Design an enzyme around this catalytic site. Structure first.
Site, PDB file in Angstrom:
ATOM      1  N   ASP A 151       0.825  -1.205   0.000  1.00  0.00           N
ATOM      2  CA  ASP A 151       0.000   0.000   0.000  1.00  0.00           C
ATOM      3  C   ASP A 151       0.860   1.256   0.000  1.00  0.00           C
ATOM      4  O   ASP A 151       0.545   2.234  -0.692  1.00  0.00           O
ATOM      5  CB  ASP A 151      -0.958  -0.016   1.190  1.00  0.00           C
ATOM      6  CG  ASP A 151      -2.150  -0.921   0.947  1.00  0.00           C
ATOM      7  OD1 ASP A 151      -2.765  -0.806  -0.133  1.00  0.00           O
ATOM      8  OD2 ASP A 151      -2.450  -1.768   1.807  1.00  0.00           O
ATOM      9  N   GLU A 157       3.614   0.876  -3.564  1.00  0.00           N
ATOM     10  CA  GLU A 157       2.959   0.812  -4.875  1.00  0.00           C
ATOM     11  C   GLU A 157       1.819   1.821  -5.038  1.00  0.00           C
ATOM     12  O   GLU A 157       1.602   2.327  -6.145  1.00  0.00           O
ATOM     13  CB  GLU A 157       2.419  -0.600  -5.136  1.00  0.00           C
ATOM     14  CG  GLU A 157       3.491  -1.628  -5.405  1.00  0.00           C
ATOM     15  CD  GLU A 157       2.979  -3.056  -5.403  1.00  0.00           C
ATOM     16  OE1 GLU A 157       1.964  -3.342  -4.714  1.00  0.00           O
ATOM     17  OE2 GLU A 157       3.613  -3.901  -6.080  1.00  0.00           O
ATOM     18  N   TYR A 181      -9.573  -1.646   2.108  1.00  0.00           N
ATOM     19  CA  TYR A 181      -8.958  -1.498   3.411  1.00  0.00           C
ATOM     20  C   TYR A 181      -8.810  -0.041   3.846  1.00  0.00           C
ATOM     21  O   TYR A 181      -8.605   0.912   3.097  1.00  0.00           O
ATOM     22  CB  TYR A 181      -7.602  -2.221   3.570  1.00  0.00           C
ATOM     23  CG  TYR A 181      -7.777  -3.637   4.019  1.00  0.00           C
ATOM     24  CD1 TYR A 181      -7.206  -4.717   3.319  1.00  0.00           C
ATOM     25  CD2 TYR A 181      -8.537  -3.894   5.162  1.00  0.00           C
ATOM     26  CE1 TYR A 181      -7.382  -6.048   3.778  1.00  0.00           C
ATOM     27  CE2 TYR A 181      -8.738  -5.196   5.649  1.00  0.00           C
ATOM     28  CZ  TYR A 181      -8.143  -6.269   4.941  1.00  0.00           C
ATOM     29  OH  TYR A 181      -8.329  -7.555   5.412  1.00  0.00           O
TER      30      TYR A 181
END
Ligand SMILES: O=CCc1ccccc1
Ligand SMILES: O=CCc1ccccc1
Ligand SMILES: [Cu+2]
Ligand SMILES: [Cu+2]
Ligand code: NA
Ligand code: NA
Ligand code: NA
Ligand code: NA
EC number: 1.4.3.21
Lengths: 620, 620
Positions: free
Chosen positions: B290, B293, B374
């Site tokens: 997270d 990238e 998320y």
């Protein structure tokens, strides 16, 4: 009307009258323990019988007695004379704290030792320390305390800053004889004071802290009924208090729509031990069981609003017995309040456009105890999402010694000439489980790593394995943090909507267990502390992991004796005993009064509910 | 005037103008990363030079560029063309999130797969997932995203409840080609909705919660100056924000009487990775970084008073660049506040008669980010007693799949037909240490058990041992919870009043590290995650544990390459990299929106101060 109500002053007064009329409470008798007995299994008879267990000490040397009394019927149920060389001595009495210092003050050996060090006997405080069981044959069946000395320069001085090292004495508190005085050499008494309210030590007090105001304009969200029954955010439980264990939680249950679902029948800290790792003969015997030898409940503090408990506080004031059977109220001994606990759940969705935030909160039940130099806060937490957590907060003053010239492998230096021996603080939580009822089992869950190969061609897979513990002889377990080891308590006869057994997962902190050599006296007397998890079959008389009479017991009582019965625990009425603790290498920052350090454990639902249990929480 | 001030909108506008005038920001260019560079070592020149690093993507297929710009001087410092097959692809762009779904909607293979399942293409959402590096030779040097599909029954529906299993597609987002469509078989699309704001799912909302009011009638105890400089209860620090790392803490120091004492030069979460443990070819490639990238800072939420942050809140609103170099403000992206934190220290003394209680508090600096399903809260805490703590709070919606008939060893069942693959959430904290200055060293501290015998006749002694890590090749360390392993960062040239080196102790949670097979692609690309602790010698260009260009990098960049230099770290300018994470076997209670779970670490002073640093805290 609830059988789990707190003991009342009236009940304790009736116990005193029953004991005295039966001839059991003459002027030479002292009550060393008094507590209410829980209802036996199968209380659905409504036939309440409030029974009290009493340990009675005799200051003239007669054998002590264990007595059970029914306040309901006004009768003595049983009275047994105890052979203390066999089954252990009674807990330390508060009135014996001063006896050690007083007896030593007239002993010629003690006075010569103080004379050599130019210490005025009127300035010497003596800590009344439990004796354990070591090599001294004359101590078997005698009530012994050991004394270590500290100098008070003036009445408000912190004696802990001035240990008198190289000197220890053993005293028989019933015969009033000093059995041994051991003087291994003169150490300088550390000279700096440790007075943490002295302006010359604190400096000017900070003026930078602005107030934080926590209020509940509409009152708290929980209700208390029947004196000690709490209902809060679908939780239901009863708050008990026992002079040995302190706060005890009964009948923890959760209202899941229609049904009141049990989770834990009884939760308590059933023992705690502080073993010292200094091999000096002055302290190598030192291991105190604050719960089993001293009774942490009787030293609970009165908690002050705004200082000890902040917010909208509801207090309980439990009643205990003094040494003569008079009721004594511990005013504001238990604080209860709810606390905001940050974000509960949150999601902003890129496709639905819905933004969602909910806040968490927890119900806090706590008390604080003080036993000599150490102070501990015991906190139970209930969270909105079904999590149950315990936290111990350790503070107070570290136990001190001299710091030897040339250093030590077992003592930290805190100030010039002032040391603090290495030690541990180890707790035992006794969790009488009742996950959706009494048919429970425990599984050990480990992460499983998988090797790259057929069916796992990219080497990314991992899994888990669960091992059911089926008999007590295989239910003594160790932690394994590297494999993510947890334990699941489930009910094989109660399934969630996915046809999986409902359960709760125990998450440990995975701190070191008892460090002493397995052949040591303390390893035998505190066997529970050598392993992280024990599971036993429920039995009325299996209450403490160390047995009923811990003081000067020679070893092996409690959990090692229980599990030898090798009972079936696979879908049965079971009890989980979890060992957890802190290993303390004292730091300079721990002196002269120690900032709180913490340890604990938690239980989280594991397929207990059919979905998240907090979907009905509103948006603040 | 501070060189650590937040980037301003004016600075970002100047960067845009500099890039455009230099010919570097034509219509085919996109800014994929833009951030301010920290001052180089030895900033005592007062010669400020605000420099910005920029990654520039080209949507027509030309080579991307890394550019450094000086806003102070208005010049391009350097511009380098990147060979992405060698050094990695640029981070995912927000504007590529929609491209995957749009390209698939016109592909005949994708449409036949949806046709067989009777799914309307207008209802199918496609998650834009990073590709990693696997067996597909045609992907080397191409910018690839992989797509997994979810059905939205209506615009406000939670698509995560309706995964389309058995189907995956790979897309080249620059050439706009669908390279592969893989269909391994029809799975039923799970039918139950997961709409956590639907009254039929929530039931009636609770009316039992009464308000908790937290206010500060005199305002907060901290001050903010220069935009982002905080002073609070002897702490001093600067709050930075970077679009990749999120909140960054600079110049953490503590005012100990006369002296401002440095502790940590720079603290950040420098990477995070979520590897999936499902061996199905539909998801066995799935590992998203997270931070490296996607850039967690650019997806920070605007935090609402009373909902996300409760109390007397001071906000920062950081400015970042959009893809065209326009400044964009993240309104209320960072919350700062102080919180009551219970008892700090407490003791009631039996001999002096003094009763003493002080309360603790902590300073909170936090932000929340959302990347797809998320959501994460990042919390930094500073405590009165010198403790520094980080906590990650994980919530949002779990990533779903079908639950296969006949079960799975790698997927949890959450609802009928609905699964959630096993996975981990693993973080890397980069701690550029400066304990009393830059000459630091790391020691590993283990508990030492001792055998009963001469000099330990009662078998009670235990000790500790410390091992200095002297070179990078020996500074890759694993946790050992059973031996109480911690790590001490000390300054050998700065001593406390007891002539001991000052230090801070790192306490880890000791959770499992990366579970994947060591020969896997993810073990090579996320090598940092296979060990708990790394120590490197400071260097300007060694910023991330995974290297600068994580997307589709073939492996071994970052920490394994750094430590091969085997530099001296014994009393040098060093950086600690701590790996910590959660292993997530999803439970039914995680559905349809997950209650927060947490993981973190903390640092406590270890002989840094000459005594307790909170003696001057007043009595409330
Ligand atoms: O905590 C029980 C041991 C103890 C008791 C009294 C004074 C000091 C130490
Ligand atoms: O967290 C990054 C992976 C991801 C991105 C967008 C949607 C779902 C999942
Ligand atoms: Cu301690
Ligand atoms: Cu997860
Ligand atoms: Na015996
Ligand atoms: Na039980
Ligand atoms: Na490469
Ligand atoms: Na450094």
């Amino acid at each position: 009307a609830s059988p789990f109500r707190l003991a009342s002053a009236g009940e304790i007064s009736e116990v005193q009258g029953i004991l005295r009329t039966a001839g059991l409470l003459g002027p030479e008798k002292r009550i060393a323990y008094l507590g209410v007995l829980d209802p036996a299994r199968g209380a659905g008879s409504e036939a309440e019988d409030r029974r009290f267990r009493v340990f009675i000490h005799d200051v003239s040397g007669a054998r002590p007695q264990e007595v059970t009394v029914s306040v309901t019927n006004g009768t003595v149920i049983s009275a047994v004379e105890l052979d203390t060389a066999a089954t252990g001595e009674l807990p330390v009495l508060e009135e014996e704290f001063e006896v050690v210092e007083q007896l030593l003050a007239t002993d010629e050996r003690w006075l010569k030792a103080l004379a050599a060090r130019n210490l005025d006997v009127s300035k010497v405080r003596v800590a009344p320390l439990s004796a354990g069981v070591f090599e001294y044959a004359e101590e078997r069946g005698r009530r012994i305390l050991r004394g270590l000395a500290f100098v008070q320069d003036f009445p408000e001085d912190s004696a802990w800053a001035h240990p008198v090292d190289g000197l220890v004495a053993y005293v028989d508190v019933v015969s009033k004889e000093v059995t041994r005085v051991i003087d291994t050499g003169v150490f300088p008494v550390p000279a700096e004071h440790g007075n943490y309210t002295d302006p010359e030590l604190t400096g000017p007090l900070r003026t930078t802290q602005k107030p934080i105001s926590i209020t509940q304009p509409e009152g708290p969200s929980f209700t208390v009924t029947g004196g000690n029954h709490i209902e809060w955010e679908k939780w239901s439980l009863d708050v008990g208090f026992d002079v040995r264990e302190g706060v005890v939680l009964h009948n923890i249950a959760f209202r899941d729509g229609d049904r009141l679902r049990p989770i834990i029948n009884r939760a308590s800290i059933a023992e705690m031990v502080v073993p010292y790792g200094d091999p000096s003969p002055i302290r190598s015997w030192q291991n105190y069981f604050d719960t089993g030898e001293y009774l942490v409940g009787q030293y609970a503090n009165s908690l002050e609003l705004g200082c000890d408990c902040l917010g909208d506080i509801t207090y309980l004031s439990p009643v205990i017995s003094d040494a003569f059977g008079n009721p004594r109220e511990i005013r504001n001994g238990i604080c209860m309040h709810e606390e905001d606990w940050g974000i509960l759940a949150k999601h902003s969705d890129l496709w639905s456009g819905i933004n969602y935030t909910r806040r968490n909160r927890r119900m806090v039940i706590s008390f604080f105890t003080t036993i000599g130099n150490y102070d501990y806060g015991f906190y139970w937490y209930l969270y909105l999402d079904g999590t149950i957590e315990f936290e111990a907060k350790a503070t107070g003053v570290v136990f001190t010694s001299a710091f030897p010239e040339g250093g030590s492998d077992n003592i930290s230096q805190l100030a010039p000439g002032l040391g603090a021996p290495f030690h541990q603080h180890i707790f035992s939580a006794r969790l009488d489980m009742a996950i959706d009822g009494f048919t429970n089992r425990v599984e050990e869950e480990d992460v499983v790593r998988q090797t790259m190969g057929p069916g796992n061609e990219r080497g990314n897979a991992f899994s888990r394995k669960r091992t059911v513990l089926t008999r007590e002889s295989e239910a003594v377990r160790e932690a394994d943090a590297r494999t993510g080891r947890t334990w699941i308590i489930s009910n094989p006869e109660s399934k969630n909507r996915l046809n999986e057994p409902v359960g709760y997962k125990l998450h440990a902190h995975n701190q070191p267990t008892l460090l002493a050599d397995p052949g040591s006296s303390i390893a035998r007397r505190a066997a529970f502390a050598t392993k992280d998890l024990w599971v036993t079959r429920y039995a009325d008389d299996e209450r403490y992991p160390t047995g009923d009479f811990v003081n000067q017991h020679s070893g092996g009582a409690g959990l090692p004796s229980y599990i030898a019965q090798d009972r079936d625990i696979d879908g049965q009425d079971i009890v989980v005993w979890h060992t957890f603790g802190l290993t303390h290498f004292p730091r300079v920052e721990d002196w002269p009064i120690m900032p709180v350090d913490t340890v604990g454990f938690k239980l989280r639902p594991e397929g207990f509910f059919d979905r998240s249990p907090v979907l009905d929480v509103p948006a603040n």
